[PDB]
Design a protein around this nucleic acid. Structure first.
Ligand SMILES: [Mg+2]
Ligand SMILES: [Mg+2]
Ligand SMILES: [Mg+2]
Ligand SMILES: [Mg+2]
Ligand SMILES: [Mg+2]
Ligand SMILES: [Mg+2]
Ligand SMILES: [Mg+2]
Ligand SMILES: [Mg+2]
Ligand SMILES: [Mg+2]
Ligand SMILES: [Mg+2]
Ligand SMILES: [Mg+2]
Ligand SMILES: [Mg+2]
Ligand SMILES: [Mg+2]
Ligand SMILES: [Mg+2]
Ligand SMILES: [Mg+2]
Ligand SMILES: [Mg+2]
Ligand SMILES: [Mg+2]
Ligand SMILES: [Mg+2]
Ligand SMILES: [Mg+2]
Ligand SMILES: [Mg+2]
Ligand SMILES: [Mg+2]
Ligand SMILES: [Mg+2]
Ligand SMILES: [Mg+2]
Ligand SMILES: [Mg+2]
Lengths: 74, 177, 49, 104, 135, 175
RNA sequence: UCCCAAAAUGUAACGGAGGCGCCCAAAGGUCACCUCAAGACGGUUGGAAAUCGUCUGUAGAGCGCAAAGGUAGAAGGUGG
RNA sequence: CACCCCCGUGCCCAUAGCACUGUGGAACCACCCCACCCCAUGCCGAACUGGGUCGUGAAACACAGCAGCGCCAAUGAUACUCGGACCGCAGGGUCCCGGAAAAGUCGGUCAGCGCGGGGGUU
């Protein structure tokens, strides 16, 4: 039963951070479910990674615990 | 039929008992519910498709089957199997069943003197229990000799437990001394 | 052996295969869909073989 | 429960589109059928039945629809999104849409 | 002593005691002044000694409880398997945490039972009385 | 309870018998140093069910009640104390010790008396008037019996903030 | 998949736990509609637990399987 | 935004929520009202829903009172800790300098900001 098992690192985390200029198609956070939630200007991939539609300054919205959003300001 | 005879007894129910500000504050009946529980002996499709037919002959409504949910048990209870017939009913389809039960059903139990008095809910809502279905002329005993029963729930408004003494009293239901 | 299988699709007079077959568990003999070969139109795909 | 109306007031997002919202209230004989620029906390061109409509009650459908379309065509409003409410979409409330774009 | 279900393996770290409330329950108490592990062997030894001094008494709580599995490896072997099973459970005990607590006996008759209990325990300890009330 | 100085913020607070504290209510909220010896000689004899007036130098004597002390674990030396400003009228949720009187059965023939709750939190609508103690006569109850808070008599207009039914003393069987 | 892993990512051990080598002609697309555990009183053979009925009910359920995240405006339960 | 009050819909995103509770009535809203048909219930006009007043504000909703429940929550002192320098064989501990919780006590609140429409003092 000696159990030497484990699983390769998943480079999950917040990629682009607050006040970074971004581009269309940049991947802005990696997550399992929706810790951070889509928000305006921002799509969300099939694996729940949200990502930019438009270019510009980035996000910052976090009052709802379990209700936090990313966004893009032209 | 029995509609205004209902409503010519609720209006007197306004008077001799209390003094509500509103005729809409009065006790009144929502729906009559009928729940067969065919899982006491669940046939694989034998009687279970028939008991719906007899209950539907009682009412002119097609019963829905209240199927079991997960909750596997001591007496081997796989989830998806049917376990209980149910028929809720309101208005004209309902008062015919209610007058039919005050009529030839409830009075003609062999051992009968009224049902459990003044003990239903903390709310005024009420519930009748049937001993067996052998109190009908819509079925012949010779065929299904081992006939079962059913369970009725008489739904009603009321805020007070003592305000149940009208849904049965001034409607045609005896209750025990 | 096997349950689920691979199964080729063949166009109503086209060519284009598409070979994404699913279970033999419940589709005991059924296998028809629609998608376009080399003619532009989506057409009927009988997935016999 | 009523969870149905919040699912459609989310299902049509605020504006990821630039369109306009058109919230009805066909729960009475008191329909309001408003037009709302959600980007600003502002409402634009309402079309109440609330002052009569000659005593038509569910028949007012077409009248409140054409009253909305007249109130909004006067202001330069031609992109629509029909925000239902709790309500289905077949008869009384469907006619407000049939009349809103007969003359929008 | 032993607990009923768990997980069954652990580790080791230390800092001073989180919740050691002084005298709930009893009048008098004994209190650790050094960090340690303490064995269910040693807890029950203190129990069995203090019972004798307070024969039909019945004034003894044990606000301390063995909890941590600890795992001596098999006696022959080079390092290599994983861990041994547990032998002997232990509870951690940081200074100022209370461990012992009698009530309803004269000071000296409780102080003597605490002296006997403190010769059975692997740490220096103090005997105390009363004052502070939290909530 | 004379006070020499009231230090601001983290200061020396010499271990020359100096304890930090505050007193606070709706308006004023003052400052630190007290005195280990005079405080603790006074804190024992005045419990928490009674007051003593402190004053920083100058004429500012003012009522206060001890409320929550904070002391050195890994030790027994007090470090900090909280005072609440006395108001002279409105009720205050003062704690009160539960004592005992007499010899019960078990105390004569069997098991011991047990104070299952050492301190109740009666509201006591009393400015200066507080109950320093609360006596509970036990010469009545036998083995297995237990006095609940419903029959814990409360002196001179003082409502109970605890459950009527919660046990407070209980003679308990031997062993 | 989760600790370890030292609040970014990463990180060893014959360290501590547990799964995969598939499934689903619908468990998919969309459109529409329902909202779950659990307990208390009362109820036909069942009565600790079938089934109905009322009241409580950020959730104590469910999500094909392992866990972790996430989820009540649904991904959960149902039809075209 | 002249003052209220009601219907819809937003920002905020329990200091706004629950319970006890009082006001409201054909102006608005709501229940009751009848249904072969549009439409619809894995049974039932309970819901969707399609045709309407009276009747009632009972239920629900709106608005007030309210600090028993929740929710928010200081100051003080801590816990820990960046950097600096040390003690103990070790488990572990200390001193200087800044940063500094959690819980608790004082307390705070039964919200605040819009837009459009309806009827009022006629
Ligand atoms: Mg192995
Ligand atoms: Mg360590
Ligand atoms: Mg330590
Ligand atoms: Mg330390
Ligand atoms: Mg504590
Ligand atoms: Mg990391
Ligand atoms: Mg790190
Ligand atoms: Mg390496
Ligand atoms: Mg290890
Ligand atoms: Mg869905
Ligand atoms: Mg409103
Ligand atoms: Mg009027
Ligand atoms: Mg109706
Ligand atoms: Mg009312
Ligand atoms: Mg109410
Ligand atoms: Mg501070
Ligand atoms: Mg350092
Ligand atoms: Mg050395
Ligand atoms: Mg520094
Ligand atoms: Mg410091
Ligand atoms: Mg805090
Ligand atoms: Mg308080
Ligand atoms: Mg209010
Ligand atoms: Mg306005």
């Amino acid at each position: 039963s000696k159990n030497g098992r484990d699983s390769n690192p998943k480079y999950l985390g917040v990629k682009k951070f607050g006040g970074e200029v971004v581009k269309a198609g940049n991947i802005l956070v990696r997550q399992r479910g929706t810790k951070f939630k889509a928000g305006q200007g921002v799509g969300m991939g099939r694996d729940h990674t949200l990502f930019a539609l438009s270019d510009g300054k980035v996000v910052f919205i976090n009052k709802g615990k379990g209700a936090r959003f990313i966004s893009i300001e032209a | 039929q029995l509609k205004t005879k209902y409503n010519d007894q609720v209006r007197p129910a306004l008077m001799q008992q209390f003094g509500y500000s509103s005729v809409m504050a009065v006790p009144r009946i929502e729906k009559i519910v009928v729940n067969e529980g065919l899982g006491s002996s669940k046939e694989d499709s034998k009687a279970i498709d028939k008991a719906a037919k007899e209950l539907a002959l009682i009412t002119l409504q097609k019963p829905i089957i209240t199927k079991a949910k997960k909750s596997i048990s001591n007496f081997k209870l796989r989830q998806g199997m049917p376990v209980g017939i149910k028929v809720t009913l309101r208005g004209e389809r309902m008062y015919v069943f209610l007058e039919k039960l005050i009529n030839i059903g409830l009075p003609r139990i062999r051992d009968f003197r009224g049902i459990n008095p003044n003990a239903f809910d903390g709310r005024g809502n009420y519930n009748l229990g049937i001993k067996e279905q052998l109190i009908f002329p819509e079925i012949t005993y010779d065929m299904v000799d081992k006939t079962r029963g059913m369970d009725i729930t008489i739904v009603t408004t009321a805020k007070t437990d003592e305000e149940a003494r009208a849904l049965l009293q001034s409607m045609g239901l005896p209750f025990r001394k | 052996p096997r349950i689920i299988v691979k199964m080729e699709s063949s166009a109503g007079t086209g060519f284009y295969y598409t070979t994404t077959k699913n279970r033999r568990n419940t589709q005991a003999k059924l296998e028809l869909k629609k998608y376009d070969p080399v003619a532009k139109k989506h057409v009927v795909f009988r997935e016999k073989k | 429960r009523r969870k149905l109306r919040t699912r459609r007031k989310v299902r049509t997002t605020t504006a990821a589109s630039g369109r306009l919202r058109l919230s009805v209230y066909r729960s009475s004989k008191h329909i309001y059928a408003q037009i709302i620029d959600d980007s600003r906390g502002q409402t634009l061109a309402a079309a109440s039945s609330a002052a009569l409509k000659s005593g038509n009650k569910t028949d007012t459908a077409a009248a409140v629809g054409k009253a909305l379309a007249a109130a909004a065509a006067e202001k330069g409003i031609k992109q629509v999104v029909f925000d239902r409410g709790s309500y289905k979409y077949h008869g009384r409330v469907k006619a407000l849409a049939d009349a809103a774009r007969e003359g929008g | 002593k032993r607990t009923k279900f768990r997980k069954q393996f652990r580790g080791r770290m230390t800092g001073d005691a989180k919740g050691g409330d002084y005298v709930a329950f009893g009048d008098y108490g004994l209190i650790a002044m050094e960090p340690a592990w303490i064995k269910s062997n040693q807890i029950e030894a203190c129990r069995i000694v203090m019972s004798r001094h307070f024969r039909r008494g019945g004034k003894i709580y044990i606000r301390i409880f063995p909890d941590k599995p600890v795992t001596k490896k098999p006696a022959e072997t080079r390092m290599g398997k994983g861990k041994g099973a547990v032998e002997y459970w232990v509870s951690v005990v940081k200074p100022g945490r209370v461990m012992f607590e009698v009530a309803g006996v004269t000071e000296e008759q409780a102080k003597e039972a605490f002296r006997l209990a403190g010769h059975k325990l692997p740490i220096q300890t103090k005997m105390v009385k009363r004052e502070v009330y939290d909530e | 309870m004379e006070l020499t100085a009231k230090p601001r913020t983290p200061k020396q607070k010499l271990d020359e018998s100096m304890i930090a504290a505050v007193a606070y209510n709706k308006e004023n909220n003052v400052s630190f140093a007290l005195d280990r010896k005079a405080f603790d000689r006074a804190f024992r004899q005045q419990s928490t069910t009674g007051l003593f007036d402190i004053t920083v130098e100058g004429g500012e004597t003012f009522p206060a009640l001890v409320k929550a002390v904070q002391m050195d674990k890994r030790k027994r030396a007090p470090i900090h104390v909280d005072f609440y400003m006395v108001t002279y009228g409105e009720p205050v949720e003062v704690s009160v010790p539960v004592h005992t009187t007499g010899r019960s059965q078990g105390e004569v023939q069997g098991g011991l008396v047990d104070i299952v709750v050492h301190n109740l939190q009666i509201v006591a609508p009393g400015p200066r008037r507080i109950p320093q103690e609360l006596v509970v006569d036990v010469t009545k109850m036998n083995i297995g019996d237990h006095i609940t808070a419903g029959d814990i008599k409360l002196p001179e207009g003082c409502t109970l903030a605890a459950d009527p039914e919660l046990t407070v003393v209980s003679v308990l069987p031997p062993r």
